[PDB]
Structure 1
Amino acid sequence: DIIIATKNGKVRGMNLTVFGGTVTAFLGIPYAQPPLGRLRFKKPQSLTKWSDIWNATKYANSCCQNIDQSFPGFHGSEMWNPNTDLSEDCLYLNVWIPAPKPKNATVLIWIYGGGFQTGTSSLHVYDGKFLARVERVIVVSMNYRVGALGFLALPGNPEAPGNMGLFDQQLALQWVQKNIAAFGGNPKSVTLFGESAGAASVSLHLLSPGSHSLFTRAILQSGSFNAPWAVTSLYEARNRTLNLAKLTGCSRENETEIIKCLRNKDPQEILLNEAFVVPYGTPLSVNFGPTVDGDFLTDMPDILLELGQFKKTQILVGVNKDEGTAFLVYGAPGFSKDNNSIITRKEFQEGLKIFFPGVSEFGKESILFHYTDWVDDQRPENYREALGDVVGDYNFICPALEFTKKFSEWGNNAFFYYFEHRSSKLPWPEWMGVMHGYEIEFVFGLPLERRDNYTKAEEILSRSIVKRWANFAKYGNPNETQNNSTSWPVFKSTEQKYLTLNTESTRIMTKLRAQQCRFWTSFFPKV
């Protein structure tokens, strides 16, 4: 019988068969009192103790969230939809441990993305058993509150303070510190990693003092806090909380009365009004996300970075080649997943209007001008690729590069990667390229499963990324082998070397898309 004694009581797990060996799995361990009733919108409350044995043998409930239903039956979009029931009772975590039991394993903790509005740790692409089997690390992931139930903010008010979903994550990290030794993990060797809003979350734990003693190293995939979507100003957060109150008939004079009113509403009455709390709305809108709450974040994150007030440790950071394309088929004119989506200069200008609602007419011309110096005048698909790159550079790539510069300047080793391989099983059309979120299955080792129809090249690539990721956690260096491997060099603010990741050739290169990013860093803020 697979039983571990945690500080909150005993828990029962299950054995998995993975590549001729065994992986012990504890799925659905609770780490907080269910944020129910009068606990809605509050920070996670600590668990006391249960007598008996909690059965950690199935994934738990996913947190309440809206579902993506733009393309019914389509794997591409539905693979991101939650695969367990939805409920406010959702603060559980998972633990994968190598067999035979380890004695001081390094721990990898996964934080999922989803625009801070969606996502769940139980998706197939986040399965930690491969990493545990192959690289002998412990893998932990947690469900955290997303949307208004996770990030609703009345700053200074303990009844609805902001950043609850971030404290949810933080409490799960506290759980690992207190309990992972019992499973065979080393609490002094803990690495956070995550993608997109998960990577922005990871970069925020770097800034937040309360998290600093709860992990060792950090990995940021396709996200950072300095992204234009990641953080709301204090008062923009409050104005959306008030707008949501108006939409549900919870407008009051007293703040606490507003919250006590919102506490009576059905979760679904809240979910259906989240879209409307912001005038504009682009496919990258974050209705309810992190804000400067005065607690988890004691200042605007760019300030804390600039002043060098963050955790001093090693980071691994990177981005995909086509971060932007995914967002174009959810709004922009002329774009479909069922077309080659070849568009005109006019449609391009409409596309820009969708993504930059508040920008002047001159400003949109600027963007257009910078991204139309064609190598070949036609090339019919020039404009389609231009829009994809505009959205990708501004929202993901250039911020990740800028965060890494600034972070590296305070004396810790950083490593930057450029992921260029398109998955052979990618359900989306080819014109969308190496999409946002489609390096994840390579990081979790899914191509190592030969029963799954991946290419041999893809198993090699995945096995390589897995080795480097796990090695970074253990040694602060993403080496593969000492011999017969490309040296991954540190990212320094002067030379700015990065490593590209694909099946053809992993090369060392410099100043990734500097000509593009120069626009966003040095001209766009002045429009």
Structure 2
Amino acid sequence: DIIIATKNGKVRGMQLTVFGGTVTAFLGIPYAQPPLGRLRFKKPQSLTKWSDIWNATKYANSCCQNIDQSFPGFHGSEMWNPNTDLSEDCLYLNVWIPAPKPKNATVLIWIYGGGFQTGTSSLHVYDGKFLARVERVIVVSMNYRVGALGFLALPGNPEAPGNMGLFDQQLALQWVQKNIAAFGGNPKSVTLFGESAGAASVSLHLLSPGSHSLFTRAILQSGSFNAPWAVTSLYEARNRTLNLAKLTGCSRENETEIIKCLRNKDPQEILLNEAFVVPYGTPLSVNFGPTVDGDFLTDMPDILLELGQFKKTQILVGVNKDEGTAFLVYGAPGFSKDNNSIITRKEFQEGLKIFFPGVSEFGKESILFHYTDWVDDQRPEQYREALGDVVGDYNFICPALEFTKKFSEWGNNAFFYYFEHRSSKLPWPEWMGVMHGYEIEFVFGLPLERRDQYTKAEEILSRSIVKRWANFAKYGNPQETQNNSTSWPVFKSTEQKYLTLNTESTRIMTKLRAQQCRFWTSFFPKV
């Protein structure tokens, strides 16, 4: 029986055997009042507190969300769908501690992605028991609100202020500050880590003054807030809230009466209509995301970043080799996860339409131009590959590299990686390569489980990554110091060194995607 006294009550955990050792898991501890009834759309409220023992022995409810049903029965898509009941009653977190109870362990706090529309902390690829066992860190993860229920904005109005899901995450950070020493953690050594929208969230906490004192450093996997999908403009946010109203029969005259009406809808009706609040979506549509609310976010974040207004600390940032490929099969014509997706020039042009819906003809031709000067054989896969690169470079890689340059210009150490290993168990086809999301299971140490049908070389890669992330969280320096490893140099504007992560040889390289990012970063924004 392991019981820990927290500020709000007693919690009971469960013991787990991992690699001949023990980890104690506390799954589903509440960290805020359930955001129901009058509380829907509002900032999370602090927990009232319980007498008696809260059993933290199973994953809690995942937040209300639309689900991926493009490939029923297929593991590659369905591994990302929630594996616990959906409910508005979803503001819970999880804690994995080493056994025996550590004395003053560093804390790793995971923030999942899902485009701010989906996701949950109970997914198998986010299981923190391996990190606790192997590195003796404490790992914490929280569910936070998504879609309209997390990000509906009527800016300035506390009935629906925007950014509720970000405040959900922030309230979980406070929970760690107030309670983690009781689990043997050191609230003075907290590193946030997150992937995609989770990484964009970590980047916004670096910018939010209310987050400054709730963490020590940060890790950003495939995302950052200056990614084109990551921040909804004030204008878009109001169009979308008003469209949503219109669709659910809630258009009113008094804004506060819009929200009161929206609070009477059942969750399904809000969810069903989320997809249509936008005139034309792309596969990366973020219908309801972060906004400049005047509260979590005090100014346009591009301006904070440019002018050096953010927490000064170390960062670790990276991307995967084929970020853009996952998205091509959710709409681009000629693509299929069940064939080699050889597409023609014309199909390419149509795919740009699908990914760049509000862009002038000239804007689109300029992309075609940058990406189709072939070298040079007339390889049939030319167009298929160019479309993946386009989608990945614009949406993930160039914004990651740009955030890292700008962050590092104000004096702090930064480290940048390029992940190029394709999982031997990947259920998606070969042409899709080193996909978006498929470093996560390396970071969490799944391939350390020998029973799991990953190769020996994958075991070793995961062990080295887990060590580098852990050393980064504890010491600010993502080195593996014992096994004659390649030193990971700081990323500086000017040299722009990065480290490649793969099974064969680890390399120091310079100026990732230099020609492509010059296009996305200095020209495309004018278009």
Q: Is the pair's TM-score, using the shorter chain for normalization, greater than 0.5?
A: yes
Deviations 1:12-34 (A, max 9, x none): 00000000100000000000000
1:88 matched residue in structure 2: 88
Q: Aligned equivalents of 1:286 and 1:142: distance in 2?
A: 21
Q: Aligned equivalents of 2:78 and 2:453: distance in 1?
A: 20
| Cα shift at 1:244 | 0.4
Q: Aligned equivalents of 2:88 and 2:360: distance in 1?
A: 42
Q: Aligned equivalents of 1:232 and 1:324: distance in 2?
A: 21
Deviations 1:242-283 (A, max 9, x none): 110000000001111100000000100000000111112000
| Cα shift at 1:48 | 1.8
Secondary structure in 2 aligned to 1:364? Answer: helix
Percent sequence identity over matched residues?
99
Deviations 1:385-421 (A, max 9, x none): 0000000000000000000000000000000000000
Unaligned runs of 5+ in 1: none
Q: Aligned equivalents of 1:190 and 1:457: distance in 2?
A: 30
| Cα shift at 1:235 | 2.0
Deviations 1:36-88 (A, max 9, x none): 10000000000021001000000000000000010000000000000000000
Q: Aligned equivalents of 1:505 and 1:5: distance in 2?
A: 47
TM-score (norm: length of structure 2):
0.99
Alignment size in residue pairs: 527
Deviations 1:211-259 (A, max 9, x none): 0100000000000000000001112111101110000000001111100
Q: Aligned equivalents of 1:513 and 1:153: distance in 2?
A: 36
TM-score (norm: length of structure 1):
0.99
Q: Aligned equivalents of 2:391 and 2:158: distance in 1?
A: 37
Deviations 1:481-509 (A, max 9, x none): 15601010000000000000000111000
Residue range with higher mean Cα deviation, 85-94 or 367-376: 367-376
2:51 matched residue in structure 1: 51
Q: Aligned equivalents of 2:451 and 2:481: distance in 1?
A: 27
**Could you say if the C-alpha distance between residues 328 and 12 of structure 1 is closer, same or farther in structure 2, counting changes exceeding 3 Å?**
same
Residue range with higher mean Cα deviation, 489-498 or 377-386: 377-386
Deviations 1:296-338 (A, max 9, x none): 0001100111111100000000000000000000000000000
Q: Aligned equivalents of 1:373 and 1:289: distance in 2?
A: 36
| Cα shift at 1:122 | 0.1
Deviations 1:103-142 (A, max 9, x none): 1000000000000000000000000000000000000000
| Cα shift at 1:451 | 0.3
1:367 matched residue in structure 2: 367
2:265 matched residue in structure 1: 265
| Cα shift at 1:376 | 2.8
Q: Aligned equivalents of 1:422 and 1:55: distance in 2?
A: 39
| Cα shift at 1:526 | 2.4
2:333 matched residue in structure 1: 333
Deviations 1:419-472 (A, max 9, x none): 000000111000000010000000000000000000000000000100000110
Secondary structure in 1 aligned to 2:15? Answer: strand
Secondary structure in 2 aligned to 1:523? Answer: helix
Secondary structure in 1 aligned to 2:457? Answer: helix
2:11 matched residue in structure 1: 11
| Cα shift at 1:360 | 1.5
1:135 matched residue in structure 2: 135
| Cα shift at 1:377 | 2.8
Residue range with higher mean Cα deviation, 11-20 or 234-243: 234-243
Q: Aligned equivalents of 2:189 and 2:498: distance in 1?
A: 25
| Cα shift at 1:363 | 1.7
Secondary structure in 2 aligned to 1:329? Answer: helix
Q: Aligned equivalents of 1:235 and 1:281: distance in 2?
A: 17
Q: Aligned equivalents of 2:377 and 2:245: distance in 1?
A: 52
Q: Aligned equivalents of 2:360 and 2:143: distance in 1?
A: 40
Secondary structure in 2 aligned to 1:461? Answer: helix
Q: Aligned equivalents of 2:22 and 2:482: distance in 1?
A: 28
1:465 matched residue in structure 2: 465
Deviations 1:333-381 (A, max 9, x none): 0000001000000100001111111111122111111111222332110
Secondary structure in 1 aligned to 2:273? Answer: coil
**Could you say if the C-alpha distance between residues 484 and 18 of structure 1 is closer, same or farther in structure 2, counting changes exceeding 3 Å?**
same
Q: Aligned equivalents of 1:254 and 1:526: distance in 2?
A: 37
Secondary structure in 1 aligned to 2:165? Answer: helix
Q: Aligned equivalents of 1:467 and 1:259: distance in 2?
A: 48
Q: Aligned equivalents of 1:508 and 1:202: distance in 2?
A: 26
Secondary structure in 1 aligned to 2:98? Answer: strand
**Could you say if the C-alpha distance between residues 208 and 12 of structure 1 is closer, same or farther in structure 2, counting changes exceeding 3 Å?**
same
Q: Aligned equivalents of 1:482 and 1:225: distance in 2?
A: 35
* CA RMSD in angstroms, aligned pairs only: 0.6
Q: Aligned equivalents of 1:95 and 1:359: distance in 2?
A: 45
Residue range with higher mean Cα deviation, 479-488 or 7-16: 479-488
Deviations 1:172-204 (A, max 9, x none): 000000000000000000000000000000000
Secondary structure in 1 aligned to 2:384? Answer: helix
Secondary structure in 2 aligned to 1:213? Answer: helix
Secondary structure in 1 aligned to 2:352? Answer: helix
| Cα shift at 1:524 | 1.0
2:203 matched residue in structure 1: 203
1:255 matched residue in structure 2: 255
Secondary structure in 1 aligned to 2:5? Answer: strand
Q: Aligned equivalents of 1:160 and 1:368: distance in 2?
A: 41
Q: Aligned equivalents of 1:424 and 1:83: distance in 2?
A: 24
Q: Aligned equivalents of 2:233 and 2:360: distance in 1?
A: 22
Q: Aligned equivalents of 2:364 and 2:253: distance in 1?
A: 41
Secondary structure in 1 aligned to 2:62? Answer: coil
Q: Aligned equivalents of 2:427 and 2:378: distance in 1?
A: 28
Q: Aligned equivalents of 2:158 and 2:358: distance in 1?
A: 33
Q: Aligned equivalents of 2:470 and 2:28: distance in 1?
A: 24
1:66 matched residue in structure 2: 66
2:400 matched residue in structure 1: 400
Q: Aligned equivalents of 1:172 and 1:370: distance in 2?
A: 44
Q: Aligned equivalents of 2:526 and 2:227: distance in 1?
A: 17
Secondary structure in 1 aligned to 2:342? Answer: coil
Secondary structure in 1 aligned to 2:251? Answer: coil
Q: Aligned equivalents of 2:525 and 2:132: distance in 1?
A: 44
Secondary structure in 2 aligned to 1:283? Answer: coil
Q: Aligned equivalents of 2:293 and 2:236: distance in 1?
A: 12
Q: Aligned equivalents of 2:126 and 2:377: distance in 1?
A: 42
Secondary structure in 1 aligned to 2:86? Answer: coil
1:287 matched residue in structure 2: 287
Q: Aligned equivalents of 1:526 and 1:218: distance in 2?
A: 31
Q: Aligned equivalents of 1:272 and 1:413: distance in 2?
A: 45
Q: Aligned equivalents of 2:189 and 2:320: distance in 1?
A: 27
Unaligned runs of 5+ in 2: none
| Cα shift at 1:523 | 1.6
